[PDB]
Symmetry: C2
Subunit: 314 residues, 2 copies
């Protein structure tokens, strides 16, 4: 165990009992839930467009080249046909959504086209205002917000509800301004914990560098749990610290196979669930300093009942 990770856990737990923490979930939880992945949808676009999926050589260019070719060559109705064909299936959610919501986020910001997180939000008991379009901010009832970058399919299976094309990201500044303003306000105000991606959401990472270049060290360094099973390049970790990122590797805790990342998705968060302050207090001077910091602001009274004391020590 690493003590910087220990105080990162301390910081997010005091943020959690403060209630000022917000989980960002990327696209890894769709992979845990056996949702249809995006790269095989690119493979489907490649076989319909070129008349063959061939070797494909699917690169970062081909992520943002092939659906553009689909749009201009084959029109937009075949896009809706493939979207109906590939994104109509349903499946029950994972325990990962439950243990994500169990830390009581004030708001939750997502980048996955499904709606499993909303169903899990209804399963937890609380209600969150779903904010997926610019019109949704007007009828925003609850103070607890479900913020949605990628949209969903609740507005039908049209192309305007989805966002996957690159010129949509080019127009995204004028398409969803208030969503971006909400996102910037939440990342300015609340502690944001990052999950569900493989360091590839580079537009969002450039937005992270944008708030870095607009706030410097006054911006609190956000936390991401690396779920890649390989050992992490420590120089890249220090570079992310220079970028202002606090990354915690799953493989630093435990590592086996590559598909067991779902279990790793539990395990570190399991380490978050039963994270107790007195668990790591192992020396007697730490005990007396801990109880001083836990009691000594109650010097101002005159008498306090013993039965009140159970409120102090959980």
């Amino acid at each position: 165990l690493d003590n910087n990770v220990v105080e990162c856990i301390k910081e997010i737990t005091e943020s959690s009992r403060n209630g000022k923490l917000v989980f960002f979930v990327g696209a890894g939880v769709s992979t845990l839930s056996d949702y249809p992945q995006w790269w095989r949808l690119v493979d489907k676009y490649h076989e319909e467009l070129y008349g063959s999926p061939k070797k494909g050589n699917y690169s970062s260019d081909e992520y943002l080249r092939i659906p553009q070719i689909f749009y201009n060559v084959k029109g937009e109705m075949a896009f809706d046909g493939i979207l109906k064909d590939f994104f109509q299936v349903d499946k029950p959610t994972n325990p990962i959504h439950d243990k994500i919501l169990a830390m009581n986020p004030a708001h939750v910001i997502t980048t996955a086209y499904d709606n499993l997180i909303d169903t899990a939000c209804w399963k937890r008991g609380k209600y969150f205002s779903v904010i997926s379009a610019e019109e949704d901010v007007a009828n925003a009832t609850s103070s607890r917000y479900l913020l949605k970058v990628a949209g969903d399919f609740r507005k039908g299976f049209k192309g305007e509800n989805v966002v996957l094309k690159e010129d949509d990201y080019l127009n995204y500044d004028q398409n969803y301004p208030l969503i971006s303003n909400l996102m910037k306000t939440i990342i300015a105000t609340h502690t944001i914990v990052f999950i569900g991606y493989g360091l590839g959401d580079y537009n969002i990472n450039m937005l992270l560098n944008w708030v870095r270049k607009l706030q410097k060290d006054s911006f609190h360094k956000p936390f991401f749990i690396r779920t890649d099973p390989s050992p992490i390049e420590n120089e890249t970790l220090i570079y992310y610290e220079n970028k202002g990122l606090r990354i915690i590797d799953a493989a630093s805790l435990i590592d086996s196979n590559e598909y067991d990342y779902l279990e790793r998705y539990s395990a570190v968060m399991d380490l978050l669930i039963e994270s107790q302050e007195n668990k790591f207090i192992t020396k007697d001077d730490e005990v007396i300093d801990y109880i001083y910091g836990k009691i000594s602001p109650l010097f101002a009274l005159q008498y306090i009942r013993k039965i009140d004391l159970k409120h102090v020590f959980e």
Copy 2:
């Protein structure tokens, strides 16, 4: 001589006959005189340390950890070695760049606003002189805004012909998209020689047609692979060199002679020795 290629050659010939023309130079024009390759230096940074994001990230952590003096030293041992090519000669005979060598400057003074848009080592081999870093890619707009202003002026001011652009920097064509957002139907539609070893697939040229940038490909014209790179340009720009109305029936001959003579109908008796100037 495809019909779009014919009218593009006509457009370049007319715009260079009076003179309204800027040749943008990518990176393969440096390789025509055999300049060292940047991804080889990226491989050197990778090997001394041990995607497109890696190509600037390994220099970035190499700058943070290994040091900028190692960057200056490896630039000294990598880019202190070149002559010029007839490609440059044809370009300047017809008459901006992205590379960092001064070979285009030597070709220019062998024979006019030379703009190296990514800086140069003229004041020395330092990190601030050129742009090859991720943050330098991010901070490129604010540091030298005069270059962006001059470039966006030259976009509308003169015709641009793209050569040697290896598509590494997409931010320049992103800025082209930004200018063409304002331009819309007023696009002067520059030309890029595709020069990839395979002939271009139909959907690729369909997108390149639809985006507005008119496209010539040497591999479409004749069998041309990248191993024959140089004569591919001799396949195209020499045709741009010999651009002439001799290359372009009876009725069009009558029409061109009529268009050459008919302004003189409004004038008086014309000097017979001055009639050589009618046909040059």
